[PDB]
From a paper:
His domain protein tyrosine phosphatase (HD-PTP/PTPN23) is a tumor suppressor that regulates mitogenic receptor downregulation, endocytic recycling, and cell migration (Chen et al., 2012, Doyotte et al., 2008, Kharitidi et al., 2015, Lee et al., 2007, Ma et al., 2015, Manteghi et al., 2016). A central feature of HD-PTP function is the ability of its Bro1 domain to recruit CHMP4, the major subunit of the ESCRT-III membrane remodeling protein complex (Doyotte et al., 2008, Ichioka et al., 2007, Parkinson et al., 2015). Altogether, this study identifies the Bro1 domain of HD-PTP as a highly selective interaction hub that coordinates recruitment of endosomal signaling adaptors versus MVB sorting and receptor degradation.
Next, peptides designed from the C-terminal 18–20 residues of CHMP4A, CHMP4B, and CHMP4C were evaluated for binding to HD-PTPBro1. Interestingly, CHMP4 peptides showed much lower affinity to HD-PTPBro1 compared with the SARA/endofin peptides, with KD values of 132 ± 7 μM for CHMP4A, 85 ± 2 μM for CHMP4B, and 89 ± 1 μM for CHMP4C. For the CHMP4 peptides only 11 residues are clearly visible in the electron density maps, whereas 20 residues are visible for the SARA and endofin peptides. All three CHMP4 peptides bind in the same way across helices H5, H6, and H7 of HD-PTPBro1, and form similar van der Waals contacts with a number of conserved residues, including the critical L202/I206 pair. Thus, binding of CHMP4A/B/C to HD-PTPBro1 requires rearrangement of these side chains to accommodate the critical CHMP4 Leu and Trp residues. Overall, the SARA/endofin peptides form an extensive binding interface that encompasses both the CHMP4 site and the S site, resulting in accessible buried surface in HD-PTPBro1 ranging from 762 to 780 Å2, compared with 468 to 473 Å2 for the CHMP4 peptides.
Author numbering:
A (entry chain E): 4 to 14
B (entry chain A): 1 to 361
The structure:
């Protein structure tokens, strides 16, 4: 959730 | 912690290029092995020469990264049509300056030229990542991506060029660069997670990974052989990295205390805040003589941690009356790696454009 948003932000 | 002052970032210098007289070798090979008039390739040689000149004097902006990738791909295309590797027919001397010695290093190997271009790709990415102020989500995002690109370039160099042409591109040194670049990318991501006020436990894990990356880089800097090679550079890098280890350990334990607060564990909250304060105090000692950028971030974080610790101890002493667990009672936070070395694809047609020597049979 929080991770998926942050993971996509970092790509 | 949404507006904590931004820590400075480490970047690597670009390598300086010497001669690479590929024109006589290509013309000789074209006549001998392809049976064609070498003068029919003057336009193609002009293009590659103009591309190399642009790449070796690369503009230090975003478009400069595209020039380096484009030139890198064209070198792969040339090598597939004209053998210029080690011991091969059309090989000519390639010369670049080694970073730590400042001395010229020559190899009769086109893959040495490829290696240096890929080093400078990672170096330029580190420069652009470190240039931004990270006070905007656009500049924070661009900086995080730049540091990941830098890790990927050095990582690609480490894997596909295990023959260290010079010591600045050796395995141990590139490993240090990769870990350092990943720590700075994770640090940029941490600033984003604290801007969004994400869940406290995730921020702790994200900050704990910053610590892990910097700990890996600090181990390499403490290696005597790496320290003797880097010289003064190891002193300057290790000073910033060692302080950041304690700085982001404090940030990690600050948010572990916030989780303890959310979980109504008010004695555990004191333990994590006191740990965060101790770690931050050690970072303050380690930051003696460092620029105001470092002092301004420590001072801001001190206002937060120092106040939260005093308030938590006051709450526990006079309201909650719960047991404060020791330091060594607490499960260490597991880092959450949410960055990665972004891959390098040398022969991606979208980054190289058409093969310059496409007509060479």
């Amino acid at each position: 959730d929080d991770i998926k948003q942050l993971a996509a932000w970092a790509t | 912690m949404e507006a904590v002052p931004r820590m400075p970032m480490i970047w690597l210098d670009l390598k300086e290029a010497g001669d690479f007289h590929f024109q006589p070798a290509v013309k000789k090979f074209v006549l001998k092995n392809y049976g064609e008039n070498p003068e029919a390739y003057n336009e193609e040689l002009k293009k590659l020469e103009l591309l190399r000149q642009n790449a070796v004097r690369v503009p230090r902006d975003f478009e400069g990264c595209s020039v380096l990738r484009k030139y890198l791909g064209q070198l792969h295309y040339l090598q597939s049509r004209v053998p210029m590797g080690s011991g091969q027919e059309a090989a000519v001397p390639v010369t670049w300056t080694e970073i730590f010695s400042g001395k010229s290093v020559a190899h009769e190997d086109i893959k040495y030229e490829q290696a240096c271009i890929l080093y400078n790709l990672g170096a330029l990415h580190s420069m652009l990542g470190a240039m931004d102020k990270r006070v905007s989500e656009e500049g924070m995002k661009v900086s995080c991506t730049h540091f990941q690109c830098a890790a990927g370039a050095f990582a690609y160099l480490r894997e596909h060029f295990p023959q260290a042409y010079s010591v600045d591109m050796s395995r141990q040194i590139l490993t240090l660069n990769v870990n350092l670049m990943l720590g700075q990318a994770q640090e940029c991501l941490l600033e984003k997670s604290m801007l969004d006020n994400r869940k406290s436990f995730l921020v702790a894990r994200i900050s704990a990974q910053v610590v892990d990356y910097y700990k890996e880089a600090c181990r390499a800097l403490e290696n005597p052989d790496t320290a003797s090679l880097l010289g003064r550079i190891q002193k300057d890098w290790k000073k910033l990295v060692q302080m950041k280890i304690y700085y982001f350990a404090a940030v990690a334990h600050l948010h572990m205390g916030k989780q303890a607060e959310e979980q109504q564990k008010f004695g555990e909250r004191v333990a994590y805040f006191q740990s965060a304060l101790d770690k931050l105090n050690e970072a303050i000692k380690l930051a003696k003589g460092q620029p105001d950028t470092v002092q301004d971030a420590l001072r801001f974080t001190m206002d937060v941690i120092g106040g939260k610790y005093n308030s938590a101890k006051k709450d526990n002493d006079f309201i909650y009356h719960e047991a404060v667990p020791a330091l060594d009672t607490l499960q260490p936070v597991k880092g959450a790696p949410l960055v990665k070395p972004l891959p390098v694809n040398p022969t991606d047609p979208a980054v190289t454009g058409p093969d310059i020597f496409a007509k060479l049979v």
